[PDB]
Design a protein around this ligand. Structure first.
Ligand SMILES: CCCCCCCCCCCCCCCCCC(=O)O[C@H](COC(=O)CCCCCCCCCCCCCCC)COP(=O)(O)OCC[N+](C)(C)C
Ligand SMILES: CCCCCCCCCCCCCCCCCC(=O)O[C@H](COC(=O)CCCCCCCCCCCCCCC)COP(=O)(O)OCC[N+](C)(C)C
Ligand SMILES: Oc1cccc(O)c1O
Ligand SMILES: Oc1cccc(O)c1O
Ligand SMILES: [Fe+3]
Ligand SMILES: [Fe+3]
Lengths: 256, 256
């Protein structure tokens, strides 16, 4: 991973980041035993492979908020730690790979269109979808699951349209057996994210969107630990007489 | 390492620390490639065993500045990553353990007294001294060196007095082969600390001081990378006709 960032810009960034932390230490009169604890915790985070976790939960939202200012299309949200490139392709109407366990869950039938800013539909458009099972696990991050469980790259039709069936997602708890969970327990916080779908939406000559969709009335939307929920990204699915949840959502892409 | 810190206090601390970093990201419009770089770097820091290094260089000064407000005695400074408890004891007049290589360097003869706040001298007083050799290495952090090279716990006399001979320290460069060195190179900074002695000064029923002594006119005192130099901690040794550097410095301890 490489970035074009000047010595100048890094210097200014570092200056107020360090300045900022240092001022927090001065403000609260952080002590030597606390500095000790903070230092051990930083070590434990890395030793626990939790940098992607801690940073995406606690910091990434700021980074998207930056990106957000330059974009007129569908609201984005954080990627999170669990995205895997090249999930196998599916046709514009499809059902996500899933186990027999998953088939037991209320289906969710997610329809819509990928359009440009003027509302025109786009051919060659892809919706990469991923989310957790009802147990709270993500495939390839849980050894029991098939590697593409609840993951696919949906090939939208010539109109930019898709109809994707999956399971209704459930509120999800971040891992709490390690230093991120410790950091949350020590301050009486909670480790919950709302029920969500993760998506990256793309089309030839367009700027992709990495986003998340949430469910109206769902638990923790007002208190997402990752601070990644936006009012515009909340779905209101209607129940069918087949008992499936139905919802239509359109994506609106900026030009690249 | 454990601290008595309430869920409340940790929550308030975390809030503005995260708030602070997040505001820096917003201020400078930190981008996704940069967030990527920052995330890889955090991983590399831990993988490189550089948390003690990075934090002591870039953060500890704030933590001492906190401690500093409550103390009337000799100015403190940061401990740094290289302190080792229980260096072998030496008599109040002594010379530090050293190699034949070291014997070649201008001697430094460091005299003084440990006193209370009213200027009274203290029996049972200890001066734990450590510093780098002229090559820039610290013992037990460089496989070629005897484990106590330039380290000792000096037993001051019934008056609180000591006379300690060692080598004149030289400006010292922090390791730059890893992520801390990378962080400094990318912003065109420098990796230098001034020539310094490290000391922890203690006496029965007194609050210890962890401090550093520096040398007048020495290189980098105005630009210490660790931001740990204070005007009050600068020595002005006089040269003898034996060609040794001579200096007297007194310690003043607060009550525990
Ligand atoms: C207590 C810990 C937290 C401390 C926070 C303060 C530090 C924040 C900034 C440090 C970012 C570390 C970047 C140094 C790595 C650059 C060299 C490198 O290996 O990357 C290079 C990549 O190319 C580069 O030159 C990187 C240039 C600097 C990029 C830094 C942007 C990161 C800023 C993010 C800070 C946001 C947090 C507030 C290797 O690939 P070639
Ligand atoms: C991008 C990275 C930087 C992010 C900065 C924001 C985070 C800053 C605060 C996080 C400090 C982590 C403390 C969590 C560990 C507590 C549980 C634990 O294992 O320690 C315990 C120790 O006992 C405890 O309860 C610790 C209570 C909280 C101590 C936290 C004080 C640290 C604050 C320092 C922040 C200064 C930086 C600004 C294990 O031993 P028992
Ligand atoms: O952004 C996130 C952070 C942690 C866990 C997740 O499932 C997630 O989407
Ligand atoms: O505080 C310090 C930080 C890095 C290297 C040192 O020798 C030191 O005293
Ligand atoms: Fe997720
Ligand atoms: Fe040092």
């Amino acid at each position: 991973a490489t970035a074009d960032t000047s010595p100048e810009r890094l210097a200014a960034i570092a200056k107020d980041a360090l300045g900022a932390l240092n001022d927090v230490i001065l403000k609260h009169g952080v002590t030597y035993p606390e500095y000790r604890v903070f230092k051990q915790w930083l070590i434990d985070v890395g030793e626990g492979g939790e940098w992607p976790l801690f940073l995406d939960v606690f910091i990434e939202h700021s980074v998207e908020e930056v990106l957000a200012r330059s974009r007129k299309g569908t609201m984005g949200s954080i990627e999170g730690p669990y995205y895997i490139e090249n999930s196998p392709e599916l046709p514009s109407k499809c059902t996500l790979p899933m186990r027999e366990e998953d088939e037991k869950i209320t289906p969710l039938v997610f329809s819509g269109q990928v359009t440009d800013l003027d509302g025109n539909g786009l051919a060659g458009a892809k919706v990469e979808l991923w989310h957790a099972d009802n147990d709270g696990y993500y495939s390839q991050f849980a050894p029991h699951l098939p590697e593409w469980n609840l993951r696919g790259t949906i090939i939208a039709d010539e109109e930019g349209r898709y109809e994707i069936t999956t399971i209704q997602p459930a509120p999800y708890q971040i891992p709490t057996d390690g230093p991120t969970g410790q950091f949350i327990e020590a301050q009486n916080g909670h480790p919950w994210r709302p029920a969500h779908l993760h998506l990256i939406v793309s089309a030839p000559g367009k700027e992709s969107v990495t986003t998340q969709l949430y469910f109206k009335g769902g638990e923790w939307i007002d208190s997402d630990v990752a601070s990644a929920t936006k009012p515009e990204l909340i779905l209101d699915p209607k129940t069918g007489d087949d008992g499936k949840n139905y919802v239509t959502y359109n994506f609106v892409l900026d030009p690249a």
